[PDB]
Design a protein around this motif. Structure first.
Motif, PDB file in Angstrom:
ATOM      1  N   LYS A  34       3.165   3.558  11.837  1.00 19.44           N
ATOM      2  CA  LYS A  34       3.961   4.066  12.948  1.00 19.44           C
ATOM      3  C   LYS A  34       4.468   5.482  12.736  1.00 19.44           C
ATOM      4  O   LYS A  34       4.836   6.141  13.716  1.00 19.44           O
ATOM      5  CB  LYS A  34       5.117   3.119  13.269  1.00 19.44           C
ATOM      6  CG  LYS A  34       4.627   1.721  13.610  1.00 19.44           C
ATOM      7  CD  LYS A  34       5.648   0.889  14.353  1.00 19.44           C
ATOM      8  CE  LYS A  34       4.976  -0.307  15.019  1.00 19.44           C
ATOM      9  NZ  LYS A  34       4.453   0.031  16.372  1.00 19.44           N
ATOM     10  N   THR A  35       4.488   5.964  11.500  1.00 25.56           N
ATOM     11  CA  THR A  35       5.024   7.282  11.192  1.00 25.56           C
ATOM     12  C   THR A  35       4.430   7.741   9.866  1.00 25.56           C
ATOM     13  O   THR A  35       3.640   7.030   9.238  1.00 25.56           O
ATOM     14  CB  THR A  35       6.562   7.286  11.233  1.00 25.56           C
ATOM     15  OG1 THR A  35       7.063   8.625  11.150  1.00 25.56           O
ATOM     16  CG2 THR A  35       7.147   6.464  10.091  1.00 25.56           C
ATOM     17  N   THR A  36       4.797   8.954   9.461  1.00 21.94           N
ATOM     18  CA  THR A  36       4.276   9.587   8.257  1.00 21.94           C
ATOM     19  C   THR A  36       5.447  10.070   7.417  1.00 21.94           C
ATOM     20  O   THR A  36       6.589  10.102   7.881  1.00 21.94           O
ATOM     21  CB  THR A  36       3.401  10.800   8.596  1.00 21.94           C
ATOM     22  OG1 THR A  36       4.231  11.846   9.110  1.00 21.94           O
ATOM     23  CG2 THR A  36       2.332  10.440   9.624  1.00 21.94           C
ATOM     24  N   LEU A  66       7.590   1.265   7.597  1.00 18.03           N
ATOM     25  CA  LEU A  66       7.055   1.843   8.827  1.00 18.03           C
ATOM     26  C   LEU A  66       5.791   2.653   8.574  1.00 18.03           C
ATOM     27  O   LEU A  66       4.905   2.697   9.441  1.00 18.03           O
ATOM     28  CB  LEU A  66       8.110   2.720   9.486  1.00 18.03           C
ATOM     29  CG  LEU A  66       9.357   1.997   9.997  1.00 18.03           C
ATOM     30  CD1 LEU A  66      10.434   3.016  10.392  1.00 18.03           C
ATOM     31  CD2 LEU A  66       9.026   1.088  11.174  1.00 18.03           C
ATOM     32  N   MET A  67       5.702   3.313   7.415  1.00 18.39           N
ATOM     33  CA  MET A  67       4.487   4.037   7.068  1.00 18.39           C
ATOM     34  C   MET A  67       3.322   3.071   6.843  1.00 18.39           C
ATOM     35  O   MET A  67       2.205   3.323   7.304  1.00 18.39           O
ATOM     36  CB  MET A  67       4.734   4.950   5.861  1.00 18.39           C
ATOM     37  CG  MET A  67       5.604   6.193   6.187  1.00 18.39           C
ATOM     38  SD  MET A  67       6.682   6.834   4.867  1.00 18.39           S
ATOM     39  CE  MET A  67       5.414   7.364   3.726  1.00 18.39           C
ATOM     40  N   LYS A  91      -0.840   4.160   1.930  1.00 16.71           N
ATOM     41  CA  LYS A  91       0.017   4.151   3.108  1.00 16.71           C
ATOM     42  C   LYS A  91       1.143   5.176   3.042  1.00 16.71           C
ATOM     43  O   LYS A  91       1.871   5.341   4.031  1.00 16.71           O
ATOM     44  CB  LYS A  91       0.589   2.749   3.351  1.00 16.71           C
ATOM     45  CG  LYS A  91      -0.470   1.682   3.580  1.00 16.71           C
ATOM     46  CD  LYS A  91      -1.319   2.002   4.802  1.00 16.71           C
ATOM     47  CE  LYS A  91      -2.282   0.858   5.116  1.00 16.71           C
ATOM     48  NZ  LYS A  91      -3.210   1.210   6.228  1.00 16.71           N
ATOM     49  N   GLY A  92       1.318   5.862   1.921  1.00 14.72           N
ATOM     50  CA  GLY A  92       2.290   6.931   1.837  1.00 14.72           C
ATOM     51  C   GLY A  92       3.315   6.710   0.736  1.00 14.72           C
ATOM     52  O   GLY A  92       3.392   5.654   0.104  1.00 14.72           O
ATOM     53  N   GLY A 134       0.780  -1.215   0.000  1.00 13.88           N
ATOM     54  CA  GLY A 134       0.000   0.000   0.000  1.00 13.88           C
ATOM     55  C   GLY A 134       0.817   1.272   0.000  1.00 13.88           C
ATOM     56  O   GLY A 134       0.234   2.363  -0.088  1.00 13.88           O
ATOM     57  N   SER A 135       2.141   1.169   0.120  1.00 11.18           N
ATOM     58  CA  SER A 135       3.047   2.299  -0.011  1.00 11.18           C
ATOM     59  C   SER A 135       3.647   2.309  -1.412  1.00 11.18           C
ATOM     60  O   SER A 135       3.494   1.360  -2.187  1.00 11.18           O
ATOM     61  CB  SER A 135       4.158   2.235   1.043  1.00 11.18           C
ATOM     62  OG  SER A 135       5.082   1.191   0.768  1.00 11.18           O
TER      63      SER A 135
END
Length: 279
Positions: free
Chosen positions: A242-244, A237-238, A125-126, A32-33
């Protein structure tokens, strides 16, 4: 999840100690990233990419990687065997020719391209961009990297291979992006790695096995190899939530293995990228 007999750098990023060979990571695996690899291209047909890689832009007569460097970096981000984030989507932007060279004007255009092009992609997800490239200081190059980051992309850039202070190189010297130095399998600063206050993090960069053109693999060294470890880690991690993109460099520094590298000059961070995955 556990990948046995993994490349040392993958094992390192999931370990509190050097000298192990299994990579441990959450099975979400960056699904998803999206990670843009801004480089010489990507050989998307390589079986290691499993259909998850594609070229989206070139400034030259072909989008194919006629060099190998971009394919190697992309493999460290996201290939099935050699990658940190084994389910991310990889997008290639060919700003470097097949000799590995590129004009700053083309590199700047490629960064601005990614800042817009992400709006044409599905990355719930980024979005991350990995820039294993650089040259001498340029305010315009740094500004382009800053814009890309500001637009909502986690920008990871190579510190450079001059065994010198990265303040004199771009985009390494841009404060707002994540500047990545290189370490070796014994937790030593890589012999060529730049250093200095502008570095945010170290990743594995000496003797890194990854994909190569012609459907092959090889081991090479550079801050170019450390950077995609960090880019893939950010995507991973995105996906975990857990983070952006705006906070991932700082989060990676927050959660890094601290004080474990040797030959870190006074004033340079002693921080080694670490996924903190508890299997």
């Amino acid at each position: 999840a556990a990948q046995t007999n993994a490349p040392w750098g993958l094992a390192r990023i999931s370990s509190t100690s050097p000298g192990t060979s299994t990579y441990y990571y959450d099975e979400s695996a960056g699904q998803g990233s999206c990670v843009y690899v801004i480089d010489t291209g990507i050989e998307a047909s390589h079986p290691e990419f499993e259909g998850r890689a594609q070229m989206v832009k070139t400034y030259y007569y072909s989008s194919r990687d006629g060099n190998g460097h971009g394919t190697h970096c992309a493999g460290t981000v996201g290939s099935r065997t050699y990658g940190v984030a084994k389910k991310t989507q990889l997008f290639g932007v060919k700003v470097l020719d097949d000799n590995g060279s590129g004009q700053y004007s083309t590199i700047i255009a490629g960064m601005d391209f990614v800042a817009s092009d992400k709006n044409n992609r599905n990355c719930p997800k980024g979005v991350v961009a990995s820039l294993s490239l650089g040259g001498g200081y340029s305010s315009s190059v740094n500004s382009a990297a800053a814009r890309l980051q500001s637009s909502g992309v986690m920008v990871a850039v190579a510190a450079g291979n001059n065994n010198a202070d990265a303040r004199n190189y771009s985009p390494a010297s841009e404060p707002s992006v994540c500047t990545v130095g290189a370490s070796d399998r014994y937790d030593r600063r890589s012999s060529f790695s730049n250093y200095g206050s502008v570095l945010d993090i170290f990743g594995p960069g000496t003797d890194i096995l990854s994909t190569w053109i012609g459907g092959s693999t090889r081991s090479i060294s550079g801050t170019s190899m450390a950077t995609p470890h960090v880019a893939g880690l950010a995507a991973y991690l995105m996906t975990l939530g857990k983070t952006t993109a705006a906070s991932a460099c700082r989060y990676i520094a927050d959660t890094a293995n601290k004080g474990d590298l040797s030959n870190i000059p006074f004033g340079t961070v002693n921080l080694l990228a670490y996924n903190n995955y508890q299997a």
